Swiss-Prot record, chain D:
The protein's assembly and partners: Interacts with host NfrA receptor; this interaction is essential for viral adsorption to the host.
Species of the source: Enterobacteria phage N4
Protein localization: Virion
Free-text function comment from the UniProt entry: Assembles to form the non-contractile sheath that surrounds the tail tube. Allows viral attachment to the host by binding the bacterial outer membrane protein NfrA.
Name this protein carries in UniProt: Non-contractile tail sheath
S-S bonds: none
Further remark: It is uncommon for short-tailed phages to have a tail tube inside a non-contractile sheath.
Residues of the full protein shown: 3 to 61 of 1382
Source species, domain of life: Viruses
Amino acid sequence: MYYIEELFCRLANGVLNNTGIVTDDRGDIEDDSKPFIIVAANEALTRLHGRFNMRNNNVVVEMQEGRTNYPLLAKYAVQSYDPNEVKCPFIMDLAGEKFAEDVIRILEVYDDKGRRRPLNDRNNPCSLFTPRPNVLQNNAPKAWEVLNVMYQAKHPKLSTAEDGYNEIDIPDTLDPALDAYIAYRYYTSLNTPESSAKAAEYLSFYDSICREVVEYDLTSDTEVDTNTLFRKRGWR
Amino acid sequence: MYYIEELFCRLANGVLNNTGIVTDDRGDIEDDSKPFIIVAANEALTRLHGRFNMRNNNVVVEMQEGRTNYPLLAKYAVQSYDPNEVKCPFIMDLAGEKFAEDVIRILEVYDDKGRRRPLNDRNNPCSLFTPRPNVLQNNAPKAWEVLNVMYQAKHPKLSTAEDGYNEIDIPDTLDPALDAYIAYRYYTSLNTPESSAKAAEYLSFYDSICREVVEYDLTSDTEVDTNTLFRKRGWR
Amino acid sequence: MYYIEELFCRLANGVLNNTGIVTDDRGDIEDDSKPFIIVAANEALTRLHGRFNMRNNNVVVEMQEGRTNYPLLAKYAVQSYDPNEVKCPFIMDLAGEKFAEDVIRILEVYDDKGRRRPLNDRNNPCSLFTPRPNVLQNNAPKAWEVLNVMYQAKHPKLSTAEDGYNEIDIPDTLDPALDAYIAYRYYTSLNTPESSAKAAEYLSFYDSICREVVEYDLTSDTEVDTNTLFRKRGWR
Amino acid sequence: IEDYLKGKNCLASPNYDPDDQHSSWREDLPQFKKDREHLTLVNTRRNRTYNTKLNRFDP
Amino acid sequence: ETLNDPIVDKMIGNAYYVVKFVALRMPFIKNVSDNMTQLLAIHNKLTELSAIYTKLDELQLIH
Amino acid sequence: TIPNEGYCCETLNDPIVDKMIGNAYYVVKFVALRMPFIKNVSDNMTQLLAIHNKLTELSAIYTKLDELQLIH
Amino acid sequence: SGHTPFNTIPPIVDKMIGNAYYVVKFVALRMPFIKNVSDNMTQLLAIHNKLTELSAIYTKLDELQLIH
Amino acid sequence: TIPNEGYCCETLNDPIVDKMIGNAYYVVKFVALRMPFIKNVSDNMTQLLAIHNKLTELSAIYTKLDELQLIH
Amino acid sequence: SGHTPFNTIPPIVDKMIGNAYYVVKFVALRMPFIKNVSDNMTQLLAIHNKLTELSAIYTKLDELQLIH
């Protein structure tokens, strides 16, 4: 983990060392050009967390009577809901761990009693459904039913504001991939043909780094488990 | 889930930073060209919702005697209709968001009795028909028959006008695809060989992102369910 | 095993002799560009430690009740931690070198009792989990449970600042690969077609050296052991 | 560094901030920066632009 | 065995140490809450207790 | 008659615990919702120890509350 | 990678149930004792500030009843 | 009645516990945590050796120590 | 490559449990003797400062006690 300022220094003394958006001392990016990097940086982090299952985070959802669709939005969180239009929040989080709507793909759902709940099983009456990728639907809200949703999560969105996040938590082996994508976005913005050729090199380099990580499995992406169907099938 | 204002800021500080369509501070797009982006944005969202089954929505249709064709148009809804033109609307959206007229493909139809009505079955006497993609036809309207239609829904049309729709609801992993497609239309409209080559690259990048999503299945597009034909065929 | 000072002298009298980044006597690199080499040097060392399992290190983690996630960060070690922030560190490096926060991939986990704890086994009730590559999760912290983690470790981060790490420990046969990768980043940053062609050659040379090491197995990367499944399966 | 020898490391403590309650999943860095600002010499390679006007033959 | 630890960490986490701190001294709290009304009775007329306390010498002359 | 239960509604730090002891989430949510009550006792533990140290001291004076009023 | 918290069911110091959970369950059962102190803390705090005066009254208890 | 054992709570100069003598890590951790006690004795071993050589001389003085006070 | 330290379970001078480990266990079981001396190091140093003088007083066994 490191501050976004270190990212600015690394870009200043890295791929963007010969650009006009760096300071005279090569210590930081130009202040007016900082939001350009921030937008690209968030985009790059989203792609990395999609190809690689690096972060697995879980959330707690409380079933409310008379409600079937449960969007996973921060406006329904207890720490961020507005009482004027929301009767009561159903997403529970902590003051220092506010929900940031980092949901990418739902993996599994367990209720408060410890039973696995099938998802998108059309032939199963008790199964849950997801009409939208970030919306959870329950067709039978009970009295004290509480659901826990474990999902693949993206990195929290960076922001230059003081209250916003200002740290990066990614495997250090993917740092060249992050720099390459940011460099690709910058050089692609310039429409000069010379910059276009340079932009493609970084994008190709970024893809090469990603496949190298997959080839050696440096992020423990591959997962195996002991066989259980042998007992269930009754082979004995 | 962000408003239309952030899209202009993201594009100004993103792919369209170099072009002159942005303000002097690169903070917003010129008002003279805002509708140009809106037309491209509406086109881009339709393409994404066609390839991916991201959004699923259902509507309630009340059968009226003497009418066999039931177009799924906004003017026939209980909300946002003209009482002078249509005497009794047959589309009910009394609660939640209004009907946005975002029908692409009908999936299944269930009546109020709880059974499933066959769709486009020419050999079935009691099957419904769709002479047009957005028009539902019933050949025997009953006294109290009510039909529920489940369909793949596109994003509602965006508009910068007053009292319009100005919110974007797409998975965050598809944001680079949205920017690439919009940039593709802008550069290809200049009729310049230098810009034409750049436009082709953005289109390929947009297609590359979409196939990446399918490869890793970040939208949970696939769907499987427990086999029920095993008991139906009497295998036992 | 040489200090960081010799690296600058070797580069000045090596691949980077012709460029102007070196002093007049070609004996050292300019102070204005020293951090530029450091960023490249840190990047190059990470790549080598990923492809090859050169370094293996182990850490000792003491379980604390009420905590299920145990990040392997420097601030949680018994050395170089803030007593005001964290009340009791759980990473013990009382002897030898301090914990350098160089975790890449967890290999195996052994507890204080002397048995092996299964890792990332979803079907095993007593298996550990890794929601993040550098974060170890235990679902049942005991009173005196202590875990030892064996992992593939990268080289500690180099820094020219005071009281930093300024020693390089890599096999001497990989030195040409280090120089080639550093030169590749320098020349590719000039955005010059003449330098871009030279940069590509160095990258290919770096890859050529690495595959030569694998071909002759100079790092003893391969590992074999006596088969134990023969008795386990009861072949006798 | 090794203040752990002096003890006083019991987890049971009364100090607690309800505004920063967090689980073991949340890890963040503090806002403290610029610890030392070490002494250093200026760089003559770059020439900084003049920002003020001085009258000639100023006393 | 039951894995109830993740629930506590997810819902309480950093505040668990406060719970342990109080739970370690439960009997001290128990011995006060049971006889809470006695303290309230003293607090009800707590003002005149100070008045008696500040006139100790006035009662010593009779003694 | 009609059911009336739930976590979002009909639940507060003031009411008492229900019969649903077995639910692990309920008891954890029970204490978490009533965190400030625990915090108020915790940070003022020093005062309670001193008072508890003289618990029998305040019991004896409690036996003659009315008699002490005669002097005043 | 990762573990859902809610799938709880898959010496003398290690409880069969979760060790950290046992402490929480211990407090929950005895909650009214803590809450009774918490809401009446101001009155108790109004006593702790001058425990010396109350102690001085006790040590001369035999002097108190002879005023009759 | 509630558990209180743990390395963090045990981080002080206290007598060892016989329950976990067989724990290999605990024995090593016990000595490593108390290194300064070993260091304090080791670096001044020469002084102790001379004192150890004269145990009988000190004991005899202590035997008639009270008589020596009246001499002063 | 590399052996986990905690994976401990697979004539006269050598020991089955390990020569290095046996010394550590030997010292640990006799720790209070070491701590007692360490806690009183200053007292021993003060005696050692003029230890010769006490010996000289000791050497005069009968002369210093017959006067008493």
